Amino acid sequence: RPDGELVRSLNRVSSATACAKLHELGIRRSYLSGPTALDLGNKVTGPARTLQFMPQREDVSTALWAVLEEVQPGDVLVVQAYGSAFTGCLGDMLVRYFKRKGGAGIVVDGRIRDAPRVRELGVPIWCTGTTPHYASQSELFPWAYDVPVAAGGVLTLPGDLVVADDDGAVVVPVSKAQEIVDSAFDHEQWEEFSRMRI
Amino acid sequence: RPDGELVRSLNRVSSATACAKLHELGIRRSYLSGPTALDLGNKVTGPARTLQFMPQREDVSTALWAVLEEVQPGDVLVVQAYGSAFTGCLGDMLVRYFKRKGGAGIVVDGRIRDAPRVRELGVPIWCTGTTPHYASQSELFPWAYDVPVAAGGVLTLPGDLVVADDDGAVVVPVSKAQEIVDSAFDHEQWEEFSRMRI
Amino acid sequence: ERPDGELVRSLNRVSSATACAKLHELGIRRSYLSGPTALDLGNKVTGPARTLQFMPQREDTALWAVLEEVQPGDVLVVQAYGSAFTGCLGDMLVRYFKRKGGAGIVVDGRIRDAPRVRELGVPIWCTGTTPHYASQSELFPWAYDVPVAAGGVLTLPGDLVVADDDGAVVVPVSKAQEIVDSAFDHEQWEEFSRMRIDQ
Amino acid sequence: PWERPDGELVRSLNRVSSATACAKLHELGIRRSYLSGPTALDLGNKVTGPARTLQFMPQREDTALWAVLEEVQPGDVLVVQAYGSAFTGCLGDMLVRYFKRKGGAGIVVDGRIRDAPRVRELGVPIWCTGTTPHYASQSELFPWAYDVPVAAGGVLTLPGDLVVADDDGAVVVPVSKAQEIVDSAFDHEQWEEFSRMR
Amino acid sequence: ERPDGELVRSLNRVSSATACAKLHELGIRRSYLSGPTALDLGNKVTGPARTLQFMPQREDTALWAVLEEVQPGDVLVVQAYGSAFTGCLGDMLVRYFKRKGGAGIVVDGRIRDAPRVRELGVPIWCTGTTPHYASQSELFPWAYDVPVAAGGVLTLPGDLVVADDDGAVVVPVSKAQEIVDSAFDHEQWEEFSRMRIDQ
Amino acid sequence: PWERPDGELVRSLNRVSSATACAKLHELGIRRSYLSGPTALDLGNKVTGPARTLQFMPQREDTALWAVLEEVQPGDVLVVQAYGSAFTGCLGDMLVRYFKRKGGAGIVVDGRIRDAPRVRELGVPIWCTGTTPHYASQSELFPWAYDVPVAAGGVLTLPGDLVVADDDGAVVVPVSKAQEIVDSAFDHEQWEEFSRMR
């Protein structure tokens, strides 16, 4: 759906700048507090495939299954798992089907299962840890697959851009995208000048 | 909607029993971890009017406004506020319109504003604290008004019964209600026997 | 340097739940001391800050220095970091504080000798209570009339404190009147809005 | 299998607060003497007596709690190590009746409690970290062994030593140092009770 | 009392992410030690527990007693409560542990002398690292071959530990074989399910 | 406005770990000597030097951070008290360039950091609690005063005293006790380096 010529231009921006400019627009809550980079040296931007977990009513995972077959290639996955230290949102298998489907990145307010195998895969993912547990093993089990999400302290709606970095993830809404792509270029260059004068 | 002859009979049950029996049915997650009683000595059961807060995207409260005018008298309000220590979900005003509308109780995974005035009102409410802040003042602002809710570690769907007590709140789903009303009577009496033999 | 005594008598007629909304109106966004909870309900305090600050220990007293300088109407804004191993005040110091007529105490910490300092009819605001005393486990006392980061807010010595069951709020002497002339506006159109919902 | 202490030292100790006792123990080379966590269930009390210690431990799905109450002699205090779990209400209404019929002095729980509305109307004083509808083995803990060295709070508590507990908190005073407090605190009371006037 | 050496050589071929699912299958629900994180990546450990337990201090050594009883293949399941003020092991004890051939260490606590105990090619699992040493701030050592509540799980002396980057899992000698005869079932129909998704 | 110390004591101290220094300070009557919180940004380092201390404080919406870097002499270490805030990235890419051009030895932050991908490729070693896209005054903190007594970690740090910092953590060694470590640790090294063989 989004303009592919913007996912490119937004990628030239760092989260630390895209967040600092989202501020002056009048939006302080754009940094996902929780998700950290599994491995160093990555940057990712793209539309946000939202995933929402909910607390498990034991017998009251084709909730999150129906997401992976809905990845228009180049998407970023944003998962709401409440920072649970006992649910693995994605395992070694479901990450394969992500990069094979054209996945750009993964951001989780939770943890991720099978760390040794999933590190040696070509997808950068942001999580709060690593568990042996799977999704529907503990107090949580998946729910929806394209709805508003409270990962971090941020409102991540389906479609918005996620400028992932080593500083963390920053949600840029599809409305204020170009407003920043142009506002950050005139910033990181002004900054780039002062870098060479020293 | 629910059978009024069950809200009565469920009220004869304590949360500590209704939760312990919800367990053996095959449901461990029924106790809302967080909400505590504002004042001692209360018990409440009724259908759950669900309220869901979401993180505030500053300029992107008629979300929670549309709940209070939807209280078929006798309801219980269950609020998802993520235990925020900087959002007052309900103030001295909106609690009046609750008991005036026929509100049975309030359960909040957050805090409540204007504690001195709201204590001298005839409604029992469960919260995690008291704030001077209002709802849309901090990182949160309301969202939906009759949807699934993750207050506590529990899945609270619209309609289910909330057997509030001093032990805390326990969500009894409309399916397993009668299964427990009859299972707890044969328990707390068996227990009541052993109370008199000592 | 206590200010207009009519500010207290007028601001004490403002809830803290309103003082935030009318300080948030003024742009002052963080004014609620996240931590201090009322020891017993029904209290209400308004007055200037006599900020007490603690800092971690090292073994290389300043706690009395505040009390010998307490003035009637003062509020004791203590920055104890929430240490559940340091009793900031006890049976003695609470007396010395009320022997002078201290209007109230707001602590980001705990209390020594809870069973006694409750019958002493002085309103307190702390994070708990401990059988420890200050400078026992992890932090000495320190400066006694300086800026203080009490909950997540800057308490500058002189500011006004509004402490009701919601918690305490810091009202600076600079922007103090703009709230009383906006709480009156609020209360009027709350009172009238309260009359109508009844009938 | 310890043995009860000099009963006239317990009565001589209940004149002492937990602050002073914790302060003297600090001066004797024992800074770990305040059980951080347990708060009073109701406002006015004082309890002194030895510690019949109960230790919970994590429940691996492969009745030693009832045996604890069988060994509760009069005048003694119960100490529980429940790791502060908000999903294991240790002692319910019934197991506290047994504690009072045996003449128990008080209860200190590094964990929540079961059947709050009832146990608040019993005469026993309890210090704990909350209240739950869960029971003692429902979730992630279960009773393990009794009368072993217990680490409740942050304090090393071995079965036998005395537990002064006012509204400040609980303090484990060992028997070998129990007299050294009564000598120091007795005259220290004449110190403090004097200067209260000038 | 180390068991069937073929259990190690067969269980070490099972990930911890699978051992949970096949212990959760057996009803054993809490088997993941919530806390211990790998010091450096790429490690893998399987062996019996030599459970070390700490308890809070009082000032009234048992830490070496474990090491003088460490046996080749042992895993050191330490219960340090996550104390960021107690260095459980240092440059010395890590050697003594590997001088005996200790297969790995799983700590619910921290580490003393991180810059050195990383070049020592022994896989560790802790909650952090501290310039403190054990029995300095808040807890003594204690029993050295008893049951241990390491993360939120009961480590009984004898059980098997599977520690890969996900964290450690406690496999009891009782129900150890039922997993290897179910991980083989899993891996086969994961491998075949992995072949197909490619093409 | 302190003054630099005996530079040949700093070089004599960089031979000492932070464990031993913290251990000696413990033996000298100073148990508060490890800044709990700050972790290394990258794995292999050691930094010793005095503390140019910066103190953040809560931001009340009514540039003393740039003035801190102006006073940074060579060989010294920077200490920041940011209360561990995950919404105030204190020093960015630029303000670390200034720190290295001035010849700063190292940075220790009781808080997160700004512009992670860049500052990891600079030669400076930093100890902090995370990484953020937020900047130094965006959210709830803002720079207050510099070169005042700083409480970063759990330690009393007054401007001037030395900060040994390996991969274990940071340790504030006061100047008056700085020599007492080098004497004790020097021979203690001959103690430990000996028994490493038997």
Coordinates of C-alpha atoms in Angstrom, one line a residue, chain C residues 52 54 63 67 76 78-83 85-90 93-94 105 107-112 126-127 130 132-135 139 141:
Chain C
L52 CA 15.6 17.8 52.6
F54 CA 19.7 12.6 50.9
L63 CA 19.0 16.1 59.5
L67 CA 14.2 21.2 62.0
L76 CA 8.9 19.0 54.4
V78 CA 12.2 14.9 51.4
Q79 CA 14.2 13.2 48.6
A80 CA 15.0 9.8 50.1
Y81 CA 15.0 7.9 46.7
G82 CA 12.4 5.5 48.1
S83 CA 15.0 3.7 50.2
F85 CA 16.3 0.8 54.4
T86 CA 16.4 4.3 55.7
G87 CA 14.1 5.7 58.3
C88 CA 14.0 9.4 57.5
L89 CA 12.2 10.6 60.7
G90 CA 11.0 9.0 63.9
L93 CA 12.0 14.5 64.8
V94 CA 8.3 14.4 64.0
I105 CA 5.7 16.0 55.5
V107 CA 8.8 11.9 51.7
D108 CA 10.2 9.9 48.8
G109 CA 11.2 7.4 51.4
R110 CA 10.0 5.7 54.5
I111 CA 9.3 6.3 58.2
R112 CA 10.8 5.1 61.4
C126 CA 5.9 8.5 52.5
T127 CA 6.6 5.4 50.4
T130 CA 11.0 0.9 58.2
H132 CA 15.7 1.4 60.2
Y133 CA 16.9 5.0 60.8
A134 CA 18.4 7.4 58.3
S135 CA 22.1 6.9 57.6
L139 CA 22.5 7.0 52.3
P141 CA 21.5 13.1 54.9

